[model samples]
Target: SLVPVYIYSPEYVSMCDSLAKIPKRASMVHSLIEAYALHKQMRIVKPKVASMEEMATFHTDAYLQHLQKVSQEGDDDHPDSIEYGLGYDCPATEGIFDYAAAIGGATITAAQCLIDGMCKVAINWSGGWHHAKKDEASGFCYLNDAVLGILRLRRKFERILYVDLDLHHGDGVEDAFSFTSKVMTVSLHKFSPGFFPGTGDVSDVGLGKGRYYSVNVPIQDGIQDEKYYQICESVLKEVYQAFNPKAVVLQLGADTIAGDPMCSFNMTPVGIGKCLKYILQWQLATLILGGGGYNLANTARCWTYLTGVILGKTLSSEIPDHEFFTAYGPDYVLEITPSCRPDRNEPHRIQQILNYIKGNLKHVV
Candidate 1:
């Protein structure tokens, strides 16, 4: 039951660059590659670019055509670009469609490998842009590769469980399968009406037959490891027992990690490792994808450690020197402390959320 991982090489790394000035995402992959090479032995597969048809599996033809047009014509000012959540959180840069297709291809490749039983577990750190919808992009996500991957998984596994640990809600994936009971979308994120793309709420389960298939655990700032770990463990155990899913798609968004500029969770990489440990023990056919993380250095460290977690390897806390070694300053270590805001979420509050989630799971039968 070995796990096969997909990563972008220096040459292929340039292909998926969002070409944005906000955060250096390309460097995150490079740093992870360098760091992981120092710890464990892994067979890294370079995924091929997905065809337009594959992209269209979860994206509309009109939106896909617009993406291609804007990328080729370099029309950042196109009306469609603005209409489709591009040019702001999602930029309409040159070769944007190619970049998105490459990211989408990584997840599809991982899903196909799982279906073929080539590997029990597969990871694509470049793929989990869960904010993309069928018609448009959102939250810097241009294409909903998570949705595409789950659709591919559905070809082989009748029951699929999607677990998102990102700080923000996985609105796109949840919305895509909002009408089907075959795919159960569960997300744990920071929730507020003013939050970006704010949709996931404890009360926001599902619609019609999809009712109770969607589970959302919304938490406040300054959530520490103990509470976060306890809540996730309880909710996941209940859902797994009730859903009886054949496969899983886990979105490993590192923004929940401490010190992330965009989020307020006080989670450390060790906390994330604990979360992964809980899911890995289930031994389900799984596809792991990356989502949002604003801190480039922290994001690299988080996924590098997760890569080792996937291989059952324990990485040393010592930071390895590489081309981007200096990016990890101050402590200059692979591990980080839980530096978050105050603990505002009470223990009983989390228990209430967990109870509500478990109650919703009763409808799966």
Candidate 2:
């Protein structure tokens, strides 16, 4: 079977003004894709801009209308703009609405590809803003493309599994499906009180009919590769066996990688790739999307490596020369060994968390 990959063209890539405040965040990953010639190796499709009606599948009309207006006119001072979570985490910039809509389109297109049976695995590096809600944007996500993709998938499939591996909790997606057994939302993230969004405790299984459907494995800082794989395999295997979902939507957030600015986890790029390997082994219809990755070089390098992993091609550690080759200064290698944070999570702690998650699995049915 074929695997289709989706990413935005150069013209459509727009970072929030906060991210644009930094030089590397806007262009690093895209440059890596172009530099490594990964685009040439797969079925790459250019996503069209999604319409308001399509966006309304998961977003509220009032919120979408306000966002559309602010996205076009650049309203940073308006009371409604701030009320809609603009100008801070989600900045109000020129063409913001179009940028988000195009990302949504690419995501929807990926879902449609899976439904059409054109591909078993579809990826969109531009689409995994899992923090956006029905009426508000949060965590630099103006549109919840992950939820939108899941909603699109739900139309054809009876059950869909959503897995989020970002540094932050996937509050928006979890909240969106908080009361339904049809969709299961799972997240593994760095958790601590006073943390941004501050949700995703192990006890937060779900509500009403959605009880036990939402699985959250919140860990402390400084966890490494083996622990990550262990926890994921333990909890996720149970979820898959019990739920028996028809399709899967995964948010591959690179911010969980070592050296990211926002979170502290010692997961190497290869570790993240291994996590994907576990999911891919299931061979279910899957849609993969990108999420939070602040450290530009590492984020780009990680995703580049992941793209190769999906294609069954091993990339050389020697960085390929390209226009942005200099951007990966100090060490221009594609491979990054885990070096950022020390391993603070002990084996017993991991077992305790996984045991609790597994215990909760019995409630999923």
Candidate 3:
């Protein structure tokens, strides 16, 4: 009943140096460390970088070379460097390319496990980096790990589903496979006006053989428990019924959770995990990968609890034990949270959005 979870720690030590530059990393690392501390029995598998050849599975040679050159320039560029989509919002760090490749390798590692029956439910916290393209890095991500993972599985899986639940759109992944029928990328994000790296509109489904394969359902800010779960339930069930995917890859981004300083989707811990429970109940083998999230405290707790929940040993809303606190520093106190309770103010507008998506999908199906 135990799942083998892979945690690729590639050049993460460098994160301490450019911590401020890589805002999303704080949540990513905190989640890993917290999960490790809480669940001692889970296995942490390590994988190396997927090399340039493996990256070429979806990326172009010129784009790979461009990342290498800009990364060595020693300074993060802005709108000028924005051409490569690497700069202030997404800086070109010391080992940006290598760090990204390592995450790609981690995702490939998970795919290999699933393909070879090494594990039924494998997870890599390093993967699900939905942003990044063949020629440019977008959002905080520098590489499209999901695309690479999908490419690796193209030969085995007749249909691969890429489900992104991050706060930002899974632009790079959706765009990369927007013309391929073998892969389907569905994104659920906070598409408020004025968000960075925009472009997850519902109308932009797919182009050719990939039409209807690419689904985008943008929701407004501040969606809570009931509404969030309803959207997850409806979209996923419908997508599976339509696609009959061979495998599912979920991008678990905690930034959408409440108390996050980044976005304003007031989702609570319980409300968020409820959807994952649905995924587990479906019993479909899935690869749970980490995605965007910034709030240190909430990110760590949410993902840590997600691992436990999926493993069928989820914790109550009570604060974690003292030994778990040892992962960070001592004197680390947690806020009081109620156990097993759903949010009361999920808003009726979210229901309208979900209803709209279902109505639109009627024609596609």
Whole-model lDDT for model 3 versus the true structure? Answer: 0.69
Error of 2 at 23 (Å): 5.2
Predicted candidate 1 versus true structure: per-residue lDDT over 127-175, tens digit per residue: 7899888998888888899999999999999999999999999999999
On the 0 to 100 scale, the lDDT of residue 137 in model 1 is 83
Among all windows of 10 consecutive residues in model 2, the one with the lowest summed lDDT is: 15-24
Q: Say which prediction, candidate 2 or candidate 3, comes out ahead on lDDT.
A: 2
Q: State residue 241's C-alpha deviation in candidate 1, in Å.
A: 0.6
1-365 in candidate 3: lDDT tens per residue?
A: 34655554435424322445445454445444454564355555666568899988778887787777766664544335657777766776666766676778878877777777666677775467788888777777778888777777775777788888888888888888888777788888877568856788777788887777788877776567667777788887887777778877788887777767774677765766787777666665578787776766566667776776777764654554443345334434332133333343345755665666666556554
List, residue by residue over 243-353, the lDDT tens digit for candidate 2: 989999999888888777775887888888888888888888899988888787888899889888877888888888876788788889987777755677777877888
TM per prediction: 0.95, 0.94, 0.84
Deviation in Å, model 2, residue 350 alpha carbon? 2.4
lDDT of 2 at 196: 75
- Candidate 1 Cα misplacement greater than 4 A, ranges: 22-24, 38-40
Q: What is the lDDT of residue 188 in candidate 2?
A: 94
Point to the candidate with the largest TM-score.
Answer: 1
Candidate 1: worst-modelled 10 consecutive residues by lDDT: 34-43
